[PDB]
Amino acid sequence: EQPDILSVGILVKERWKVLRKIGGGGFGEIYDALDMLTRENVALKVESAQQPKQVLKMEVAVLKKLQGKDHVCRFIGCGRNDRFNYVVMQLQGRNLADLRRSQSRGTFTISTTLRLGRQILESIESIHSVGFLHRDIKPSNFAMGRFPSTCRKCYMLDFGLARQFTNSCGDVRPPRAVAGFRGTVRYASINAHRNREMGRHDDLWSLFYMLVEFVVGQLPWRKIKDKEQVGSIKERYDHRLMLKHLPPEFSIFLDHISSLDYFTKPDYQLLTSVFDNSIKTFGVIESDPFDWEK
Numbered sequence: 001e002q003p004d005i006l007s008v009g010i011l012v013k014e015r016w017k018v019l020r021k022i023g024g025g026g027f028g029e030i031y032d033a034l035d036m037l038t039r040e041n042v043a044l045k046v047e048s049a050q051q052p053k054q055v056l057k058m059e060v061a062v063l064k065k066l067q068g069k070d071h072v073c074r075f076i077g078c079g080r081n082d083r084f085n086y087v088v089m090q091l092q093g094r095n096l097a098d099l100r101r102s103q104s105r106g107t108f109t110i111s112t113t114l115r116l117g118r119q120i121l122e123s124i125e126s127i128h129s130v131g132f133l134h135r136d137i138k139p140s141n142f143a144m145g146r147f148p149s150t151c152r153k154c155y156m157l158d159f160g161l162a163r164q165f166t167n168s169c170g171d172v173r174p175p176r177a178v179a180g181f182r183g184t185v186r187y188a189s190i191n192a193h194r195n196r197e198m199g200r201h202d203d204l205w206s207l208f209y210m211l212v213e214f215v216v217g218q219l220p221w222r223k224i225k226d227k228e229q230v231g232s233i234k235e236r237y238d239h240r241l242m243l244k245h246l247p248p249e250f251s252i253f254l255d256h257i258s259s260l261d262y263f264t265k266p267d268y269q270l271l272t273s274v275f276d277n278s279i280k281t282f283g284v285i286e287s288d289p290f291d292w293e294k
């Protein structure tokens, strides 16, 4: 097989010492590096300068646009050379995909589910607010922080598959007739399955699928490998069935996102109220242990 894009031990730009590969994402690799200017560990994403689909230009654009916002890594640096392109950003902790898989039945409690869900909704409204769609909402794109002050904060980790959906003014851009989906079958909306231009609502469908998987431990199309079979299930599926194990106000959430299309701005305050009201009804407070603490 092919070697890692970077050799562990090298120094990037006389500053970032590559320590270990920590992931092999969709379109590149991620490393733990030592930043010798700040004397801290950081995350270093890289892609080959020669690979057919390169997304780190999008990663840098969105990370920069989101600086100052919650739920996003601090931007540290970026560069392009004949061998590779790279982006450096804040290193986070345990990934939600791993935390969920460590649970007894791959389920989180409603306490952990509601708090994570509300943080993730905040992160989606934030990326939409600067004119980008995420298009790849799934548990492995979120992690908790790795310090006492950050480990109760959930971070949106990656923006590779993002698309700008507005003008400078906030005008929604005319959709393409066909849009070739490159994200994850399991959490993709029907519109992704249909190679339609994705909208703000498609990120909220993916959040709805994540929340259901958190509470139930699986989605109805878990064992189906064929993308066009999954899509056929989603097209026909009565999503009200997924309300069974969610707090009652999720009927409002589901009715709202069902009403949306590419050209309709979500009612983010309504969707936030579903989480706020559910959290109060269930007596959840922010300091309650998450499932992985206790």
Ligand SMILES: Clc1ccccc1Oc1ccc(Nc2ncnc3[nH]ccc23)cc1
Pocket (backbone or CB within 6 Å): 022, 023, 024, 025, 030, 043, 073, 089, 090, 091, 092, 093, 095, 097, 098, 140, 141, 143, 157, 158
């Ligand atoms: Cl590929 C995968 C699938 C499922 C569960 C974990 C996985 O591994 C990683 C490893 C690292 C990341 N990303 C990050 N991690 C830690 N700090 C980070 N700052 C920015 C990104 C980033 C994501 C998934």
